[PDB]
Amino acid sequence: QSTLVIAEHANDSLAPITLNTITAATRLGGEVSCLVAGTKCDKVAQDLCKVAGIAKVLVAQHDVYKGLLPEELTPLILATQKQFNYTHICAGASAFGKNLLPRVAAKLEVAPISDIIAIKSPDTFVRTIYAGNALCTVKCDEKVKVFSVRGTSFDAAATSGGSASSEKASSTSPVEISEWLDQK
Amino acid sequence: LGFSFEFTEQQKEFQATARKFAREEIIPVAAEYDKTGEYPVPLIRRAWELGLMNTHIPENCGGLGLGTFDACLISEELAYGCTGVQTAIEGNSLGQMPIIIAGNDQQKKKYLGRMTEEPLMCAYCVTEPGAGSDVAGIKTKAEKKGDEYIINGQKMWITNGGKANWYFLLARSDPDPKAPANKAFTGFIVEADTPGIQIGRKELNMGQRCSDTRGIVFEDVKVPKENVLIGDGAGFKVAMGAFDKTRPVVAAGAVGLAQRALDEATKYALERKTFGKLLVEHQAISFMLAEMAMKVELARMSYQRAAWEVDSGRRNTYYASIAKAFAGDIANQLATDAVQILGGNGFNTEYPVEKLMRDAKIYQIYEGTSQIQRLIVAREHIDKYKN
Amino acid sequence: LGFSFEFTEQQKEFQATARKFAREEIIPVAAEYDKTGEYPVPLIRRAWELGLMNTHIPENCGGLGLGTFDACLISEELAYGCTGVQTAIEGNSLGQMPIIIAGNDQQKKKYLGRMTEEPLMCAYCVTEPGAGSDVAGIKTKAEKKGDEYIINGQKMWITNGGKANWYFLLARSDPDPKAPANKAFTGFIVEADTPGIQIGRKELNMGQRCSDTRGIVFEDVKVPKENVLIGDGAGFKVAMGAFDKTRPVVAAGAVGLAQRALDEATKYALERKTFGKLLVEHQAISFMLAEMAMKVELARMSYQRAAWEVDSGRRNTYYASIAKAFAGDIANQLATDAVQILGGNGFNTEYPVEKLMRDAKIYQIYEGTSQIQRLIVAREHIDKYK
Amino acid sequence: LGFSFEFTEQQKEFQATARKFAREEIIPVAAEYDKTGEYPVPLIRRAWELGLMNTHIPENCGGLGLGTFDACLISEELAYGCTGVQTAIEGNSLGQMPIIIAGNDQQKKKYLGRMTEEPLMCAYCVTEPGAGSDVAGIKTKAEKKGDEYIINGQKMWITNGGKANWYFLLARSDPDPKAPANKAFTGFIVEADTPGIQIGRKELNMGQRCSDTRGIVFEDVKVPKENVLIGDGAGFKVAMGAFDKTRPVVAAGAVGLAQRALDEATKYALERKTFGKLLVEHQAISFMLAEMAMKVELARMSYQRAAWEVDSGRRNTYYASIAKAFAGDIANQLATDAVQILGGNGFNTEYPVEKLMRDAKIYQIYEGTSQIQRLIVAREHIDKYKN
Amino acid sequence: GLGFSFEFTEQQKEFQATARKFAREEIIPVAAEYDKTGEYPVPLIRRAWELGLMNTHIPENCGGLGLGTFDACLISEELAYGCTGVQTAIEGNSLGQMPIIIAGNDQQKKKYLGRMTEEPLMCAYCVTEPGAGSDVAGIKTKAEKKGDEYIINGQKMWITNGGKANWYFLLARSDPDPKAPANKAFTGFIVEADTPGIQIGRKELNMGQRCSDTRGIVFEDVKVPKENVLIGDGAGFKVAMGAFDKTRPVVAAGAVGLAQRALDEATKYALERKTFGKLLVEHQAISFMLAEMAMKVELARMSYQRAAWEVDSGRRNTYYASIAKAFAGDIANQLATDAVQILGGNGFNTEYPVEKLMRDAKIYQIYEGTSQIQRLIVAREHIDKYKN
Amino acid sequence: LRVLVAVKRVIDYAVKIRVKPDRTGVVTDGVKHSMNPFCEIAVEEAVRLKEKKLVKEVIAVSCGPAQCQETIRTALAMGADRGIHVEVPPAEAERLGPLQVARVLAKLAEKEKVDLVLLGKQAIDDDCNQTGQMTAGFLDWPQGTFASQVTLEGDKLKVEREIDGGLETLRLKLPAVVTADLRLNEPRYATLPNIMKAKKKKIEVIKPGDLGVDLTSKLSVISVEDPP
Numbered sequence A: 001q002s003t004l005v006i007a008e009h010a011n012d013s014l015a016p017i018t019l020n021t022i023t024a025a026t027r028l029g030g031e032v033s034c035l036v037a038g039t040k041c042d043k044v045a046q047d048l049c050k051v052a053g054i055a056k057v058l059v060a061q062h063d064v065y066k067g068l069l070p071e072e073l074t075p076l077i078l079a080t081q082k083q084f085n086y087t088h089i090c091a092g093a094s095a096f097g098k099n100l101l102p103r104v105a106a107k108l109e110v111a112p113i114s115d116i117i118a119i120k121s122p123d124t125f126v127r128t129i130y131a132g133n134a135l136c137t138v139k140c141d142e143k144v145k146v147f148s149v150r151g152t153s154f155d156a157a158a159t160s161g162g163s164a165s166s167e168k169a170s171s172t173s174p175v176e177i178s179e180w181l182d183q184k
Numbered sequence B, D: 001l002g003f004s005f006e007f008t009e010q011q012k013e014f015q016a017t018a019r020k021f022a023r024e025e026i027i028p029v030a031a032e033y034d035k036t037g038e039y040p041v042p043l044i045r046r047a048w049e050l051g052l053m054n055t056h057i058p059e060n061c062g063g064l065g066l067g068t069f070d071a072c073l074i075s076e077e078l079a080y081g082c083t084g085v086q087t088a089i090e091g092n093s094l095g096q097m098p099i100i101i102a103g104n105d106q107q108k109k110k111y112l113g114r115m116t117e118e119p120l121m122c123a124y125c126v127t128e129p130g131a132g133s134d135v136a137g138i139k140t141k142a143e144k145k146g147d148e149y150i151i152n153g154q155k156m157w158i159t160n161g162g163k164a165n166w167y168f169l170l171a172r173s174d175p176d177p178k179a180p181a182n183k184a185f186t187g188f189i190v191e192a193d194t195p196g197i198q199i200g201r202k203e204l205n206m207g208q209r210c211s212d213t214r215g216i217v218f219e220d221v222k223v224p225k226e227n228v229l230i231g232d233g234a235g236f237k238v239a240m241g242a243f244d245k246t247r248p249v250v251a252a253g254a255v256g257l258a259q260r261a262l263d264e265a266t267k268y269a270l271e272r273k274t275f276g277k278l279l280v281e282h283q284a285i286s287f288m289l290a291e292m293a294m295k296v297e298l299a300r301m302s303y304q305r306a307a308w309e310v311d312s313g314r315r316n317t318y319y320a321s322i323a324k325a326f327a328g329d330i331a332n333q334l335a336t337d338a339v340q341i342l343g344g345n346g347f348n349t350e351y352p353v354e355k356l357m358r359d360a361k362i363y364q365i366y367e368g369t370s371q372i373q374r375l376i377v378a379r380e381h382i383d384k385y386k387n
Numbered sequence C: 001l002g003f004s005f006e007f008t009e010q011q012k013e014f015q016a017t018a019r020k021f022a023r024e025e026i027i028p029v030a031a032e033y034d035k036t037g038e039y040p041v042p043l044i045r046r047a048w049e050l051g052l053m054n055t056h057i058p059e060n061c062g063g064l065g066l067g068t069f070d071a072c073l074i075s076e077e078l079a080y081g082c083t084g085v086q087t088a089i090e091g092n093s094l095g096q097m098p099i100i101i102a103g104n105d106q107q108k109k110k111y112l113g114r115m116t117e118e119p120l121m122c123a124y125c126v127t128e129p130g131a132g133s134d135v136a137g138i139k140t141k142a143e144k145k146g147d148e149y150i151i152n153g154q155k156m157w158i159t160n161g162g163k164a165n166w167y168f169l170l171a172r173s174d175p176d177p178k179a180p181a182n183k184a185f186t187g188f189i190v191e192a193d194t195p196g197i198q199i200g201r202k203e204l205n206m207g208q209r210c211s212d213t214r215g216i217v218f219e220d221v222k223v224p225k226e227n228v229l230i231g232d233g234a235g236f237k238v239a240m241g242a243f244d245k246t247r248p249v250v251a252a253g254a255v256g257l258a259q260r261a262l263d264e265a266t267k268y269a270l271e272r273k274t275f276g277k278l279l280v281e282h283q284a285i286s287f288m289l290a291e292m293a294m295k296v297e298l299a300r301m302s303y304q305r306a307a308w309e310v311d312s313g314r315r316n317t318y319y320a321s322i323a324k325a326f327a328g329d330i331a332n333q334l335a336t337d338a339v340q341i342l343g344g345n346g347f348n349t350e351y352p353v354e355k356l357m358r359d360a361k362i363y364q365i366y367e368g369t370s371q372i373q374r375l376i377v378a379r380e381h382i383d384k385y386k
Numbered sequence E: 001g002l003g004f005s006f007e008f009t010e011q012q013k014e015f016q017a018t019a020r021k022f023a024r025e026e027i028i029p030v031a032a033e034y035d036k037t038g039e040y041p042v043p044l045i046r047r048a049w050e051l052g053l054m055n056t057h058i059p060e061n062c063g064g065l066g067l068g069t070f071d072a073c074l075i076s077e078e079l080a081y082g083c084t085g086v087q088t089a090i091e092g093n094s095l096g097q098m099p100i101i102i103a104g105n106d107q108q109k110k111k112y113l114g115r116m117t118e119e120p121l122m123c124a125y126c127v128t129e130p131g132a133g134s135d136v137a138g139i140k141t142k143a144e145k146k147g148d149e150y151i152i153n154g155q156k157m158w159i160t161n162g163g164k165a166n167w168y169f170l171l172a173r174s175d176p177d178p179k180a181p182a183n184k185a186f187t188g189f190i191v192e193a194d195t196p197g198i199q200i201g202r203k204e205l206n207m208g209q210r211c212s213d214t215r216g217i218v219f220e221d222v223k224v225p226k227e228n229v230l231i232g233d234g235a236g237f238k239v240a241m242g243a244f245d246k247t248r249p250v251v252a253a254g255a256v257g258l259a260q261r262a263l264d265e266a267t268k269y270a271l272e273r274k275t276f277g278k279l280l281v282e283h284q285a286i287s288f289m290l291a292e293m294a295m296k297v298e299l300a301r302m303s304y305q306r307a308a309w310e311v312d313s314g315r316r317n318t319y320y321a322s323i324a325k326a327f328a329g330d331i332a333n334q335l336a337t338d339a340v341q342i343l344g345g346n347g348f349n350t351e352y353p354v355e356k357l358m359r360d361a362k363i364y365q366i367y368e369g370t371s372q373i374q375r376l377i378v379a380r381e382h383i384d385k386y387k388n
Numbered sequence F: 001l002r003v004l005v006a007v008k009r010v011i012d013y014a015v016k017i018r019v020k021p022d023r024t025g026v027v028t029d030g031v032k033h034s035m036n037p038f039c040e041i042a043v044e045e046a047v048r049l050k051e052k053k054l055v056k057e058v059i060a061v062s063c064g065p066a067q068c069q070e071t072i073r074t075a076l077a078m079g080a081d082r083g084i085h086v087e088v089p090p091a092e093a094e095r096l097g098p099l100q101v102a103r104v105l106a107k108l109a110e111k112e113k114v115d116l117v118l119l120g121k122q123a124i125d126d127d128c129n130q131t132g133q134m135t136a137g138f139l140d141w142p143q144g145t146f147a148s149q150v151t152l153e154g155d156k157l158k159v160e161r162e163i164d165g166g167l168e169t170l171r172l173k174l175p176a177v178v179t180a181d182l183r184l185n186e187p188r189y190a191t192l193p194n195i196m197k198a199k200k201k202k203i204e205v206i207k208p209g210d211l212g213v214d215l216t217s218k219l220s221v222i223s224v225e226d227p228p
């Protein structure tokens, strides 16, 4: 059983919430693949490589991944899923994270799992529910686990000691049904 | 002078007599007397032997010539034992009092003397089927026909009424409807055996079941003018006058009852457990026993105060009614709670609180209702403020 | 939908039957029954004939299949008449509750059915000389023995205990003293003719003198495993559960007696005169009467509410406990006030009101005392907060 | 056909809106408005915008034509916020009620119509410096000058009395003091700008400080004939027939104040520890919260009943007066208790409970005192048993 | 003994006419103003001091009158009939004094009692904290011994005269060990109010008694010398606990004082107001109220009297004081609301004197022990009579 | 433009929540429920656009028991024109989630011929924040999630949305899905007049079988507890 991590990033700067994701990733006990999508990817790909836990870094560089739009990225992640067949696809339960995965799930026709804080095993998870006033434990029996991961619930993985291969990701056709316009 | 809430050595000993008496002689038979309703003559009689009865009768008749404070303090101890028996005892004082305050050396020596030599009983006779609270509305007729007056009418609820040597009786003597109470009534001493006096059945009451309560009919009954109180038409003042030195002793009675309730409830709360703690470690129970103790303590001072005002020759009405009203209510309040603290057992005949509840109710009712005690308190109070 | 305070046309028939029975048949003899304290067998049989008894029994078993709101109309009417009588009647339906809510069809047809064919009685045996309020405190042990259970212990204060065909019995199953209520008790149906059951003497109480209350002892009593209620150790939940459907009916008794007291007292103050006026024209008397009318109305709406709550499928623990507490206390306040309005007459056994004072005290003791009732309300109430 | 205690879905939405507004807009500023005694204009205008005011105004007059049961449920929700403000807005229904029950199409469109269009206030003018509970002892003379009427005299304690467009005003129409009360008074609609009206300064009261309450002098006020309620002398029927549909609303306010007491005391008793435990784990405090919950619960059914009786076109004088008596009393009881539970804090001006004690007292005085509520319930009660 | 007696010593009638004269001629005309503004009522306090009716428990050998508890109550009731804002400012004095009286030595008694004799100085009782009031043993103010001194770090809350005091009696936690029983974890101090570490807080705004000042005060690093501990270390709790015997009966006497006022105002009013043809007092409902009110005051009076006599006599009066405090407080409230009531709409008004009484009365159920706490103490005391 | 607004009946936030002994879920019996506060925000947005006259009609959908009548009715009172209840008995309600619902809402979207589905960003009960995304997923339309500002531009939406550092700004082609976030707007009250007027407006009750949707969930709650 293999796992895939959508790395969140920005301006050549791995987003911290990804390191936590990668700790959570290794808990599952399977080769951890991490996917870097964007318009200048190579720098982060290089930091991601150094990181412990990571067997393979896949890179998808392309101008169209301006603002990491979920309509662009979803078929990219889907394309990777076909060539490789992961049991797990996770991302840091951040605004980027929460926006992307439930769509990916729809596209896979599996039901995702949000904001998890522990990992009881490769198919059992623990989130909060009702402004966290209860603790929910969910068994997922899908062909694919899709889920996002609460940052503060896992330690940041060592940024050094990684022996990861960096490979070209499989490519997808620019959708252009959405477009990035601006920030703050 | 200055305040003192301390008894005389003489008082401390009267009290010890009556405690000993009520605790060893009354308590162990009361339930038995209450179950049957038999009038407790051994007891009345033992009370007399001990000087705990007819206490208000002066020395010049062989009486103890004691104060209202003394009668009160005795009465609490007896009522603790049983208010059925103490109401039969006190009965005697209610009847004697109008003779004590308003009759003449002749009248006292004949009718009080006798009580001093044999344990006789006498009674107060005023209430009638149609009036109790409204004394001005009594209809028993009393007209002069010679050197004597003839009596027609009916009394109801007379304590000792069927056990009495004599009666203090009050009849309307003035036919004129428009005649004031101040003038319209005469008070009589009346020997029980007279022709024309027919005593009715023992009345069966909720509580104080061994006290003797009956109705009395007066059919053409003749009493000598020698037996008139201060004079014709001055009856209302005589009867009203008595209430000063009797009302506090009724309130001590209730306090006696109240105290019993408290002790039974406290003794029990100290041996029954539920949910692992003693009753008494349930704060709601502590708080009940706490409010109960308060009520007893305050009601005691209430009567003590009215007793002292009079013993010192002041008029009393206000303090006495406060005490009567207050001690009355608290007896009742204390009795449900004492029943309540014993729970299902409290409800049952084999425990002593059930009786206390039944007994405690007359205190709101006789010797002046809870309602009319409030009328009296109000009018006495409103006077302090009027020009 | 909308709020509504009108009985159903059918309910009004029950109420009419019940008022007619209580007024034409209970009132005329109740004074006597209190005096002699004997079990009112004929009025019971008649209550039974007339449909006013075992009312919770399902159509399935030949019962009338009625709700707690229905049971409550009737008991108010019966209690107005006499709570002695009305107690003896409800005791049956309290006996029945644990079987109605937690029997299987064998037990229901067997022990409910018979009550349909014949005016039999049953009782609820939970209390013990040692524990009443504290139910987890009961010390009657029941030991298993193959296909049947041996009950050893002693129950106290049983309504109709002594006139019953069978009993609901709660007993301490688990002998290890560390085990929680939730698993330490089994509830049984126990046939009364059973050997080992010694019914004690008639207990002599302040009030409700004609109700049959007594203690019963259980010596090696044998109870078949078919008579266990849901299973070993489910005794608590069973008993506990009965209370939702019954507590409102004790409340309605309290309201019945209350109503009577107000009736007696009002009737009287419209005819006695003092100081030239009818009692009613003294403002202190009127204010009492007002306050009394006030409490009965409030008290009746509290049971009504409770009864509808359970009848509409939800738990009513909070409201039932309110109804009990409030009705119980105002029962006692009204009775003492009625005696008070009637003066010396009031203190006298030849008038109807002193009996009310002695009856009403029970309403603050059985089926959960005033204090236990507040515990329940507080716990219910607080729990809507954290 | 069955008791029900579930609202209509329409009524739950009403409640949710009334509760949203009260929790979110009234509460956050209620203490300011209480400190400063300024009239809550921004809030009235909001509630008016929301459709929460003048709920009784019939459809054909531009209003919602809603029942008494609906006003009650709205107004409970608002009282919970502040009875100061709940009272300012209720007083509009109180002034409007005589018109709604007893006024001709011209009158209802004229004077109720405005209220639909701008958010104006009106007020019920009845009390005077020298009669309040004795409506019949009202002495503000009104005299005919063919054409119109001339009002002379003086009103006291008028809610909205200085912020009103118009008045329902009740005056002695008939000089003969032997005249029966049911024919002696005429009730008028009276535009507030009318020359001769002198409104007084704000009355500085203990509680509901942000309510406008003030006295008014009338001097030679000219009121037009078409503004008379039913006809000359009819006033007393009119004035009295209003309380039917208002009294349950007032009660519903007392219960508002009461939940709030209950809620604040419970929150606090869940955080504060003494002696190692939370307040809720001392039985005495539980038992308190218990008795508060019960009194809240029953106060609520009592007004719900009253409101339903009148919505079935029955008159509800018994029921309303039970609710107003009971709600009044328990609101007072719950207030001190909330203040007691919060200890030192409770008594301080920065915690919310102390206001509630000051506000609650009015509920035993306005719209009929605890005393006269009891006279009504006694009147209605006795009549059931007489011939 | 001699009989029971309910008659004052001529000397006490003498003290009564004075306190009653002041209360009636000086307090009453101004009390509504001081309640409106909260101004601390300096002219009256000075005048009370002057008139000899303040610091009355101070023993003669410190230059006071060494008056008894009965005498203090006697006076309290009179000042409280006038105003309990005022009466409370006067009392606060006794309350800070009492532990110096019962537990100080001659050098303390004379330096600190002595000074109140020669100027109308104020002192305070400093115990209650934000987090503990009723549960005294719950207080957290620290006292660490450091040389011949104590350093105090803590916050205090609801302190009467807290902002006007020449000095404070202070209870603090001496010993850090949580598990240390109350009879050993606290120390009692005299702390002069102007010591460097002390920061008075603002005037605290309450519903009632709005003219005494009550304030929180913080002690940051406060220096307090050895010579100012009360019996020694770990004695603090008994020392505070023992002041109440001599003072609970006076606060109850306070309640009784406002109670009587309420009755008086309500009675005068019902005597002059008419409705439906007659004066209020001719309606039975009112009459009966006036009657029950009359009862409650009377009984509440005997109750505090009783308590002050027991101690004057030299017994421990815990039981009697606590009935007095419970019952007096409860009836003061009851009577205040009923006074408002009897006055109708007028009662709810600011120009009539009754709403104030209603606001003032609530505190008697809270401070100097709450109703619950009173009830705990009594049940405790009752239940012991029944054990061996 | 026609708009579809999703509304979810949730345990009213004020109710302080209690967990079941049997630890299977939380206590949902006799427990006040209103419209999820983010749905409130979305319903508001349907209406402000309908106010700016850029929308000719607003439909309101809800999925669960019948008590979602209550929920749809509130929406109707705020400005929604007709309502759709998708019916699922309080048995199958338990195991229903964002997947089911998006499936539902998508079939619904194409059927009623809509140009915008408005949802709130997350339900305060299950905290999923999944439905909107998933629904955009099934329709293959673009999604402006966590909208904090919205604007129609002919056939393009301009969505300002709320991202970790500040705001991001998108242009989407116009069948679009938008999920509302707190800062979007301040939702209006149901006015007593409109709560009355809303009784008149009708709610078509249909079932998921009808729409063409299967409810089976290879997800599964194992347990629910209290917190640490």
Ligand SMILES: Cc1cc2nc3c(=O)[nH]c(=O)nc-3n(C[C@H](O)[C@H](O)[C@H](O)COP(=O)(O)OP(=O)(O)OC[C@H]3O[C@@H](n4cnc5c(N)ncnc54)[C@H](O)[C@@H]3O)c2cc1C
Binding pocket: D272, D274, D275, D279, D282, D284, D285, D340, D341, D342, D343, D344, D345, D347, E125, E126, E127, E128, E131, E132, E133, E134, E135, E157, E158, E159, E160, E161, E206, E214, E363, E366, E367, E368, E369, E370, E371, E372, E373
């Ligand atoms: C204006 C006024 C003046 C004051 N002046 C002084 C002063 O100068 N010096 C000083 O030291 N303090 C003073 N105080 C403090 C006052 O003594 C306390 O507020 C009170 O004694 C206990 O108050 P608390 O607020 O801590 O009550 P809490 O301890 O917060 O208790 C709150 C409620 O819980 C009840 N309760 C607490 N424990 C129990 C229990 N075990 N069982 C049952 N019920 C319980 C209480 O009776 C009360 O109803 C003053 C207070 C007031 C506000």
Ligand SMILES: Nc1ncnc2c1ncn2[C@@H]1O[C@H](COP(=O)(O)O)[C@@H](O)[C@H]1O
Binding pocket: F005, F006, F007, F008, F009, F036, F038, F039, F042, F061, F062, F063, F064, F098, F101, F118, F119, F120, F121, F122, F123, F124, F126, F127, F128, F129, F130, F131, F132
């Ligand atoms: N059962 C449901 N019925 C209708 N709409 C829903 C439902 N569940 C979720 N939604 C929509 O999806 C949003 C959040 O779903 P979730 O991802 O579960 O928080 C809500 O604001 C709704 O607008």
